[PDB]
CSV table of N, CA and C in Angstrom, one decimal:
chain,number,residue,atom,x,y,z
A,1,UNK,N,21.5,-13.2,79.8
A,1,UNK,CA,20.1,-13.6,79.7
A,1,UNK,C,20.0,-14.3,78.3
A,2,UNK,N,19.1,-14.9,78.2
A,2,UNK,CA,18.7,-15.8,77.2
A,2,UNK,C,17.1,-16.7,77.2
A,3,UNK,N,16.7,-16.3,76.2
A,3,UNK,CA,15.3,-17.3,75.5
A,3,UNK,C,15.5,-18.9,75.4
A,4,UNK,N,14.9,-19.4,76.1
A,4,UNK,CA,14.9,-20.9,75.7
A,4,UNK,C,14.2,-21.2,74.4
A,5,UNK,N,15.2,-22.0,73.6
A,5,UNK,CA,14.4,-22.6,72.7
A,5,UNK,C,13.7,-23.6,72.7
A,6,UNK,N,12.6,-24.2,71.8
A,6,UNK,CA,12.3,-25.6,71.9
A,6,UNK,C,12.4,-26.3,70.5
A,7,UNK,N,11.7,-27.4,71.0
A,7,UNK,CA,12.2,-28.9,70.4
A,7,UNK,C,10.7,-29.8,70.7
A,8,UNK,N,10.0,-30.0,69.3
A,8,UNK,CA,8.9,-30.7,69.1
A,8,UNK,C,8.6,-32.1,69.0
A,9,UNK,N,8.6,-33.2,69.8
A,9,UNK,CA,8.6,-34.3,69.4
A,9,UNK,C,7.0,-35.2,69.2
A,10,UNK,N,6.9,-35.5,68.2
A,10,UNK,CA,5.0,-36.4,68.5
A,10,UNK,C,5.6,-37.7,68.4
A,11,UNK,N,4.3,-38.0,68.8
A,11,UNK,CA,3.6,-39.3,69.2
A,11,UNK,C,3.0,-40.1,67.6
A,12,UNK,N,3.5,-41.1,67.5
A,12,UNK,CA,3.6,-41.9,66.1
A,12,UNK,C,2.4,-43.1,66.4
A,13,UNK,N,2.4,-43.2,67.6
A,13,UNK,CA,1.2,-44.6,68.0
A,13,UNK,C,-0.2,-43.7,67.3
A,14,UNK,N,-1.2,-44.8,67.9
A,14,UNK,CA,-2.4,-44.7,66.9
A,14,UNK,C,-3.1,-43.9,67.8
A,15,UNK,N,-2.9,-43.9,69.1
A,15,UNK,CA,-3.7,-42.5,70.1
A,15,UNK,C,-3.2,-41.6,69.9
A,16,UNK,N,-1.6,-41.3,69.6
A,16,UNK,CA,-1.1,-40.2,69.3
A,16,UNK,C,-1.3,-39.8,68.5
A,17,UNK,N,-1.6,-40.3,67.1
A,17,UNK,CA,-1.9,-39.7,65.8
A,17,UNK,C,-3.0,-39.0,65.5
A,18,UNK,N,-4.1,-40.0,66.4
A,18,UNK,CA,-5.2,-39.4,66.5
A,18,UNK,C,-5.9,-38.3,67.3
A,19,UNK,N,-5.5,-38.0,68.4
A,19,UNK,CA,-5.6,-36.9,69.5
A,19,UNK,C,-4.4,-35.9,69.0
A,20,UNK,N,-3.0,-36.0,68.6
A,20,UNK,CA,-1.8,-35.1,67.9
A,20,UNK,C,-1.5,-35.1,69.2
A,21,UNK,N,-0.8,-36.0,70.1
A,21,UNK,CA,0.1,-35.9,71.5
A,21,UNK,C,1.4,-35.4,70.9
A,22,UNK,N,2.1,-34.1,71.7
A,22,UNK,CA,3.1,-33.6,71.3
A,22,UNK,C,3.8,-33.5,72.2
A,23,UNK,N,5.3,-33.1,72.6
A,23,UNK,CA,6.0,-32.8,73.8
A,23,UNK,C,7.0,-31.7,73.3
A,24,UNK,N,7.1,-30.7,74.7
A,24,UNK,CA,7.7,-29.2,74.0
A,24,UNK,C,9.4,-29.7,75.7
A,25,UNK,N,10.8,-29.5,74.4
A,25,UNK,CA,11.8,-29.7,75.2
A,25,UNK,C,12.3,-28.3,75.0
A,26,UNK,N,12.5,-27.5,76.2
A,26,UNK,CA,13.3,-26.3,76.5
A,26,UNK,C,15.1,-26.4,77.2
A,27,UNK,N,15.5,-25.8,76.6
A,27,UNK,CA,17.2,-26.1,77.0
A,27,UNK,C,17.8,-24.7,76.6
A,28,UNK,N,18.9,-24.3,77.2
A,28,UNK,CA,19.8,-23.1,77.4
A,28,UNK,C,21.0,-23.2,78.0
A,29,UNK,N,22.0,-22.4,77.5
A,29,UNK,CA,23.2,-22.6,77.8
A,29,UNK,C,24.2,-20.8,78.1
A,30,UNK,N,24.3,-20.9,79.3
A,30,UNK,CA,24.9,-19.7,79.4
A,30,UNK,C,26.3,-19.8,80.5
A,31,UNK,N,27.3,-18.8,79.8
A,31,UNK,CA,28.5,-18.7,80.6
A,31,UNK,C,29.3,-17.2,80.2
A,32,UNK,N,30.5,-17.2,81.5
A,32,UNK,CA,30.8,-15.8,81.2
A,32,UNK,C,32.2,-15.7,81.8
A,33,UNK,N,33.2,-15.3,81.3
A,33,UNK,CA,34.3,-15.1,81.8
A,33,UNK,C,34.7,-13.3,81.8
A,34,UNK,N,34.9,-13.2,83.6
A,34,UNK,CA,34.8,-11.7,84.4
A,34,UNK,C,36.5,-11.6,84.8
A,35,UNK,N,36.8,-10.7,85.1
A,35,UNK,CA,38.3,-10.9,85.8
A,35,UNK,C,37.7,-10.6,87.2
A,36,UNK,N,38.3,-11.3,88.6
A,36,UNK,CA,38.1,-11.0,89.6
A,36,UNK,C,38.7,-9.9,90.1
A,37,UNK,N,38.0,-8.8,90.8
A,37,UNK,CA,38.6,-7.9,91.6
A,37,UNK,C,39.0,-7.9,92.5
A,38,UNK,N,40.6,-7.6,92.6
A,38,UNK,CA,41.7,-7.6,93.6
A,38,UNK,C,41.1,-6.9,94.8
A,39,UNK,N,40.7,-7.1,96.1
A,39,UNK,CA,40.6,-6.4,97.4
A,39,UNK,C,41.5,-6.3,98.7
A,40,UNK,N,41.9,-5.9,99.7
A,40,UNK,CA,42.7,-5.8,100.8
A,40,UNK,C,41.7,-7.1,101.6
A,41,UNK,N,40.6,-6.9,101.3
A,41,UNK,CA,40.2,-7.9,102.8
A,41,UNK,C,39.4,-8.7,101.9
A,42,UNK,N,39.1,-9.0,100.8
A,42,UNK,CA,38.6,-9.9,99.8
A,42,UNK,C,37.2,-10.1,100.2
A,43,UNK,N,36.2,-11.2,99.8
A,43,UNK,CA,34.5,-10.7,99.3
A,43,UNK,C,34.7,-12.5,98.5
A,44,UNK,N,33.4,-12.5,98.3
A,44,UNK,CA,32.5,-13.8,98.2
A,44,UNK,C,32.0,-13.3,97.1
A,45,UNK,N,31.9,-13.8,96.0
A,45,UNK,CA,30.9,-13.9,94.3
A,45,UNK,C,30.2,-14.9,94.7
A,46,UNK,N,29.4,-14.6,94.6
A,46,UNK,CA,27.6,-15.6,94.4
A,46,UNK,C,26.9,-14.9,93.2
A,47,UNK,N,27.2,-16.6,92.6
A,47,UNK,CA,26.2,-16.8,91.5
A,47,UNK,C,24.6,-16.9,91.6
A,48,UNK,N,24.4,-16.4,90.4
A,48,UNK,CA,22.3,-17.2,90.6
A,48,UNK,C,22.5,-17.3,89.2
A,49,UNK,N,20.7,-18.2,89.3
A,49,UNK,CA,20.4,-18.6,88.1
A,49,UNK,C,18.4,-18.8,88.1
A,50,UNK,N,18.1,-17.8,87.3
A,50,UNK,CA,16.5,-17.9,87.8
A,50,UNK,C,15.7,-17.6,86.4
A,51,UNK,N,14.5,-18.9,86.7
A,51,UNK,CA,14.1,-19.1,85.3
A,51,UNK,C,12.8,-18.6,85.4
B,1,UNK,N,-4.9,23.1,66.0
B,1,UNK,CA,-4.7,21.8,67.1
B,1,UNK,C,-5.3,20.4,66.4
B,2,UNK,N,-5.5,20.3,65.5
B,2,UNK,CA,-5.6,19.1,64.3
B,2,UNK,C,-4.8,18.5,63.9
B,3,UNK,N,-3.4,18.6,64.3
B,3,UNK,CA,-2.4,18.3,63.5
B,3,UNK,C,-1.7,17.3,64.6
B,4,UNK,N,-0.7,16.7,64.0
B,4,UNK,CA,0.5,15.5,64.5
B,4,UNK,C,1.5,15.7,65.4
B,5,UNK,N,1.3,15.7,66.8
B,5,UNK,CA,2.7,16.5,67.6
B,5,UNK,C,3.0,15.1,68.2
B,6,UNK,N,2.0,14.1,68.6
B,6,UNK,CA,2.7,13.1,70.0
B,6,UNK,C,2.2,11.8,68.8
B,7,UNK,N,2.7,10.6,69.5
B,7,UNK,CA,2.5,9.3,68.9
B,7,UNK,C,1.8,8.3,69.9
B,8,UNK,N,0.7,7.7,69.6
B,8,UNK,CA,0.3,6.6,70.3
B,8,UNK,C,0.9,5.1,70.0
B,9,UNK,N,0.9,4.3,70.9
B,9,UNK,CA,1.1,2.5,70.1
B,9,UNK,C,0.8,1.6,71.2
B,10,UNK,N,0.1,1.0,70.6
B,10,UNK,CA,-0.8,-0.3,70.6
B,10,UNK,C,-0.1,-1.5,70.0
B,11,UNK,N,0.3,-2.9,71.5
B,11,UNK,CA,0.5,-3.9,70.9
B,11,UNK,C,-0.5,-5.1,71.4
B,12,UNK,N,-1.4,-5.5,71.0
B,12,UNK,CA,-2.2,-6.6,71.3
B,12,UNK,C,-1.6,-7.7,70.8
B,13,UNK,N,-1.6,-8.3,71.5
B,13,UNK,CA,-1.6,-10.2,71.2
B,13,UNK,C,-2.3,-11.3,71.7
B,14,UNK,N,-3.7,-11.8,70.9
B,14,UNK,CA,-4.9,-12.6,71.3
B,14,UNK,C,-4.6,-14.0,71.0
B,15,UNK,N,-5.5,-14.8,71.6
B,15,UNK,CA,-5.8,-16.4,71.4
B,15,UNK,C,-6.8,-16.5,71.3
B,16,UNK,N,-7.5,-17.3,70.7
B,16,UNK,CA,-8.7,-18.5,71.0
B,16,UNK,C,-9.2,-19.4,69.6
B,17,UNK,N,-10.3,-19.5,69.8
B,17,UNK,CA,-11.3,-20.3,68.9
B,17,UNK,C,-12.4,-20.0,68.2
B,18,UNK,N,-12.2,-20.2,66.5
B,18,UNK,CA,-13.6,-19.6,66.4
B,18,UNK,C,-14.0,-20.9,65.2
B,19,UNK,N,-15.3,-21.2,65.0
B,19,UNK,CA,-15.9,-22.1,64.4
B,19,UNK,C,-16.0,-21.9,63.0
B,20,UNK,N,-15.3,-22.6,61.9
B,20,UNK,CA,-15.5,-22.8,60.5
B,20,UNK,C,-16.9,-22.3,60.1
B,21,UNK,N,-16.9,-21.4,58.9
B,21,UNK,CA,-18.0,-21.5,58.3
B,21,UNK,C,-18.7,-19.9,59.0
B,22,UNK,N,-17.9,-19.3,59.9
B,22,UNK,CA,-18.8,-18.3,60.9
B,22,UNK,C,-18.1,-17.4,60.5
B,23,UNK,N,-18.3,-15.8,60.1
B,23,UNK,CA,-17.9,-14.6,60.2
B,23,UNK,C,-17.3,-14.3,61.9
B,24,UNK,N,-16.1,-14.6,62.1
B,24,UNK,CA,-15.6,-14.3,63.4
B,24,UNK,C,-14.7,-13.2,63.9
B,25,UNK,N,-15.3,-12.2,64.2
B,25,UNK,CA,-14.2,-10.7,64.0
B,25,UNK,C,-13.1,-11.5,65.6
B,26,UNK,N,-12.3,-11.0,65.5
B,26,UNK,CA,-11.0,-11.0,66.1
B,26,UNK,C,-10.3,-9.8,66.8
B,27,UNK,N,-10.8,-8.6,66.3
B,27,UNK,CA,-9.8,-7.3,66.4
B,27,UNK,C,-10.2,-6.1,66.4
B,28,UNK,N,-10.4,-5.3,67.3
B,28,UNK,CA,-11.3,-3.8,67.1
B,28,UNK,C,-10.0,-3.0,67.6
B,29,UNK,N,-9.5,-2.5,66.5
B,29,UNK,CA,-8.3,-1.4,66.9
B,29,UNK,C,-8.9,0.1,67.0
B,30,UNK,N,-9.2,0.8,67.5
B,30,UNK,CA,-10.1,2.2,67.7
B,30,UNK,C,-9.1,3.1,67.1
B,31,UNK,N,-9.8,4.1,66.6
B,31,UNK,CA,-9.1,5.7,65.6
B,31,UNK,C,-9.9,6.5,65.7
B,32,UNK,N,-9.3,7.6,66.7
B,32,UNK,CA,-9.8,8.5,67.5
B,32,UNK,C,-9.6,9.4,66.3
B,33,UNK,N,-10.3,11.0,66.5
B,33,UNK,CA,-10.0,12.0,65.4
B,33,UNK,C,-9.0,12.4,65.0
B,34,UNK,N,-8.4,13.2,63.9
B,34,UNK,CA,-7.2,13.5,63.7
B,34,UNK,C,-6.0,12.7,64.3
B,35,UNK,N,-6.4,11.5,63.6
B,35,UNK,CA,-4.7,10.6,63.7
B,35,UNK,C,-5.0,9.8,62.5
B,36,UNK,N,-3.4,8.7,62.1
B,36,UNK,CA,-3.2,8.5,61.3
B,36,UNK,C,-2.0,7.6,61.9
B,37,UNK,N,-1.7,6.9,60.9
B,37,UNK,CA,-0.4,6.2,61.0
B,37,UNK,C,-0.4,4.2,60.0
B,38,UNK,N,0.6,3.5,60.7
B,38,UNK,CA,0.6,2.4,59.9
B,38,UNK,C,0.1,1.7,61.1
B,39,UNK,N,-1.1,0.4,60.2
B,39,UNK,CA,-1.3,-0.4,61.0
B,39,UNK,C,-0.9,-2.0,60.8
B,40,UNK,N,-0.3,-3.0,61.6
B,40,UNK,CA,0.1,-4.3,61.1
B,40,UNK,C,-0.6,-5.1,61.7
B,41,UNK,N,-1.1,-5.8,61.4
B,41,UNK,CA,-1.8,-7.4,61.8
B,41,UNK,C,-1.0,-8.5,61.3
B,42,UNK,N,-1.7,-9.8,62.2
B,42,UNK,CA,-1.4,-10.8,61.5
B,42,UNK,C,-1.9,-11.4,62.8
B,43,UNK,N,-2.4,-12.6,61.6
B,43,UNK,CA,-3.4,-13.7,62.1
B,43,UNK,C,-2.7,-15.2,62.0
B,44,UNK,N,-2.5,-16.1,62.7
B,44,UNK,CA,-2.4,-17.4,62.4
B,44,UNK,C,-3.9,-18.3,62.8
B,45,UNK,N,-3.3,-19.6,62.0
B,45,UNK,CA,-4.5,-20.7,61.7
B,45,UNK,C,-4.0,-22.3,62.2
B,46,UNK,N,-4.4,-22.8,62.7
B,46,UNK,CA,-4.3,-24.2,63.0
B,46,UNK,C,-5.5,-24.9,63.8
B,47,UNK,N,-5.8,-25.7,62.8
B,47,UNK,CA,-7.2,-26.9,63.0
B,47,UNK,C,-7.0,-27.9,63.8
B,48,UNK,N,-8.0,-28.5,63.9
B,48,UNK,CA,-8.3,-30.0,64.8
B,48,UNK,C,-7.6,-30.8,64.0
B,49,UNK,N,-7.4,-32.2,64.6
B,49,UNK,CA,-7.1,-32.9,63.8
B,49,UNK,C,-7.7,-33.6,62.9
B,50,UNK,N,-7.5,-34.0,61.5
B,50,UNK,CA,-8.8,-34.2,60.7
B,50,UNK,C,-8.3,-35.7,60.0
């Protein structure tokens, strides 16, 4: 699990400056190395990922 | 039976708007009899564009 961070960009034009138009970028990065368990009749890993 | 055995806590977290220039209360945390403890606040500020 993990919190997205963000990332603030504005708007430099002259409606931007004046109203303060802003944009919010979220991004995350997740990974995991498991050893697989050995079975007689073996099995399916399914991933998820839910935000 | 006046005294300190259990603990209460309270976490509020508000938004909104209030107009320069106006006495604008924000926060009524209630203290019932015989209690006691630490209280923390904190307020932020950010205006229109000017």
């Amino acid at each position: 699990s993990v919190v997205l961070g963000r990332q603030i960009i504005g708007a430099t034009d002259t409606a931007g400056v004046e109203d303060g138009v802003k944009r919010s970028d979220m991004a995350a990065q997740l990974s995991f190395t498991v050893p697989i368990p050995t079975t007689e009749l073996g099995g399916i890993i399914v991933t998820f990922a839910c935000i | 039976y006046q005294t300190k055995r259990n603990v209460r806590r309270e976490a509020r977290t508000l938004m909104g708007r209030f107009k320069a220039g106006k006495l604008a209360p924000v926060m009524a945390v209630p203290v019932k009899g015989s209690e006691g403890g630490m209280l923390s606040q904190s307020v932020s500020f950010e205006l229109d564009p000017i």
